[PDB]
Amino acid sequence: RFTEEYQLFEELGKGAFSVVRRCVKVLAGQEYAAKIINTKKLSARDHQKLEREARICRLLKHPNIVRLHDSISEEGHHYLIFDLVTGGELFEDIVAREYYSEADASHCIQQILEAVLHCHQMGVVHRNLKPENLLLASKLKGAAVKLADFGLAIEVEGEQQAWFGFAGTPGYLSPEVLRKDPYGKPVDLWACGVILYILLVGYPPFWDEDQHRLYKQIKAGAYDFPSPEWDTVTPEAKDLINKMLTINPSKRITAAEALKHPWISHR
Amino acid sequence: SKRMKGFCLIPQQSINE
Numbered sequence: 554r555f556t557e558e559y560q561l562f563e564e565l566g567k568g569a570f571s572v573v574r575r576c577v578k579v580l581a582g583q584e585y586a587a588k589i590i591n592t593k594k595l596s597a598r599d600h601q602k603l604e605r606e607a608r609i610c611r612l613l614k615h616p617n618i619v620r621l622h623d624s625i626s627e628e629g630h631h632y633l634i635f636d637l638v639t640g641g642e643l644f645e646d647i648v649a650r651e652y653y654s655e656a657d658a659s660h661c662i663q664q665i666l667e668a669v670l671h672c673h674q675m676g677v678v679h680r681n682l683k684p685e686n687l688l689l690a691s692k693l694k695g696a697a698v699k700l701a702d703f704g705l706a707i708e709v710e711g712e713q714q715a716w717f718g719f720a721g722t723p724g725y726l727s728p729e730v731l732r733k734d735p736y737g738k739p740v741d742l743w744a745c746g747v748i749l750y751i752l753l754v755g756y757p758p759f760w761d762e763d764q765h766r767l768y769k770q771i772k773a774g775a776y777d778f779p780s781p782e783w784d785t786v787t788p789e790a791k792d793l794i795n796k797m798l799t800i801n802p803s804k805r806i807t808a809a810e811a812l813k814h815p816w817i818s819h820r
Numbered sequence: 821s822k823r824m825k826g827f828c829l830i831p832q833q834s835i836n837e
Contacts, residue, residue, distance in 0.1 A: 569837075648829055651822055685831050705834060722832045755822040755829055782821045 555625050555632050559587065565639070570594040575637065585622060588633040592626070602704065603631055609703045612675055617668035619688060619701045640689030640696050643748075647684055649692075652755035652782075655790055656820070661698050662749050663817050668700045669745065670808035673738045681705040681721045682744035684751060709737050723764060724757050728772045728800045739802040742811065746797025753790055754782045758798065774800045789816040 559576045565586060566573035576587040592600055610621035610633075623634035640646070643661070647653065653661060665687065672679055679700065686702040707717045714735040721730060727743040729736040750758040758776030761767040770776075776798060778791055793816045796806035811817065822829070 644829070644831055681834055683832070705836065720834065720836055722834050724832055751829065756827040757829070 555627055555630070559585075559632075559634070561587065576634070578634075584637045586635040586637045588635060590631040590633070591629065592631050593629045600631075606704045606706070607633060609677055609706045609708075612677060613672065613703070615668055615671045617664040617697065617699050618671065619699045636699070638688040638690060638699055638701075640691040642685055643687035643689060643698060644684035646689055646692065647751060647755055650755075653752045654694075655753070655787060655816075657694055658749065658752040658790075659816060659820065660695055661752060662745065663812070664698045665700070665745060665748065666808050666811045666817065668698075669741045670812065672700070672706075672741070673808055676708050676710070677703070678707050678709055678717075678738055679703065679705070679741050679744070680707060680717070681725070682741055682748060683722050683725045684748060685722070687748070712737065723767055724759055726768070726771055727802070728774070729802050731768050731772050736802065738807070739805045742797050742805050742808065745808075745811065746794050749790075749794050749797060750776065753786055753794075758794075772800070774798055787816065789814070792816070 558580070559578055562575040564572055564574050570591045572589050574587050574589060576585050577583065578585065590603060595603065607621060607624040614620065619638060620636045621633060625632040665682070669679070669682070681702065682700070688699045688701050690697040705720045714737045716733065716735050719730065719733070721740070725744045725747050727736065727740040730740055747758060759767060759770045761770060778786065793811065793814045796814070797811070799805040806814070
């Protein structure tokens with residue numbers, strides 16, 4: 554039984570037809586986050602989506618990816634045993650601090666890039682990167698960041714592109730996805746550009762309350778660096794945002810290239 | 821700055837609710 558090996562304690566978080574609770578593996582004494590999904594509320598198709606997310610999590614072992622340690626199916630309940638990460642989402646911390654210093658944003662994006670690079674080398678594309686699902690080890694400056702929520706992730710064959718469907722989060726969507734073009738790994742680096750812009754000034758590069766006009770902004774790469782807040786941001790921060798928010802997906806910087814950019818490598 | 825311009829950072833769900 555799940556309850557034979559793990560003891561449940563307090564709720565840490567709440568999803569649709571899911572909760573997250575702190576748990577201890579009894580024999581080990583080790584603490585984990587248990588995502589408990591009510592599979593009574595899911596069709597076969599959506600059960601199988603859950604088993605796919607678990608399988609992709611199992612492929613990925615990396616200090617900046619939330620590690621799935623176990624996946625247990627019981628009558629009406631599925632349990633996903635993750636690393637316990639208690640720092641809350643990157644999103645909440647950006648709102649609390651308003652924006653990050655270049656030193657803190659650089660250390661943050663460097664870890665995201667290592668994680669994305671690992672995903673891309675394993676043939677996994679997240680498709681849905683955003684501060685909302687990047688988890689912090691703590692509220693302390695320089696805290697380790699981890700990628701979470703592989704529920705929309707896909708597997709690609711080498712550098713081959715294909716139409717993998719319309720999915721992700723509106724404000725973070727790549728122009729190639731909005732065009733319905735075949736796509737691959739670069740969609741993640743567009744999302745990294747959006748995340749980096751948000752990190753440095755605390756608002757997104759693309760937004761309109763009209764989703765059509767939001768989508769026209771993204772497809773046209775219509776963002777800028779308004780004064781006064783962007784006046785004190787280094788040209789190299791801007792240059793790395795520009796190479797990530799490149800509409801052409803072949804010209805757009807890769808995770809491997811981003812890790813060599815002077816704003817990452819020459820601190 | 822974000823606060824002086826009254827800009828907001830608001831969480832977004834995925835397309836696939």
